A = this chain, B = another copy of it.
Amino acid sequence: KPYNKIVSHLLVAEPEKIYAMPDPTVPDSDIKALTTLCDLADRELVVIIGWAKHIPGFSTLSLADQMSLLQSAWMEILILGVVYRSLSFEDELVYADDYIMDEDQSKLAGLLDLNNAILQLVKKYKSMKLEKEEFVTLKAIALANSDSMHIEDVEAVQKLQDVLHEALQDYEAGQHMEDPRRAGKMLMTLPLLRQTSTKAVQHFYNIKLEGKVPMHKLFLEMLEAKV
Which A residues fall within an 8 A CB radius of B? 120, 141, 145, 147, 149, 161-162, 165-166, 168-169, 180-181, 183-185, 187-188, 190-195, 198-199
Contact of A195 among B120, B168, B181, B198 (CB under 8 A): B198
Question: Apart from A183-B184, A190-B190, what 5 extra A-B contacts exist at CB < 8 Å?
Answer: A161-B188, A168-B184, A169-B180, A187-B188, A188-B190
Chain B residues in 8 Å Cβ range of A184: 165, 168-169, 183-184, 187
- Residues of A contacting B: mostly: helix
Chain B residues in 8 Å Cβ range of A149: 120
Each complex incorporates copies of this chain amounting to 2
The docked-state distance in angstroms from the alpha carbon of A185 to that of B162 is: 8
Instruction: Return 21 A-B CB contacts under 8 Å, by A number.
Output: A120-B147, A145-B188, A145-B191, A147-B191, A147-B195, A165-B184, A168-B184, A169-B181, A183-B184, A187-B187, A187-B188, A187-B190, A191-B191, A191-B193, A191-B194, A192-B194, A194-B194, A194-B195, A195-B195, A195-B198, A198-B199
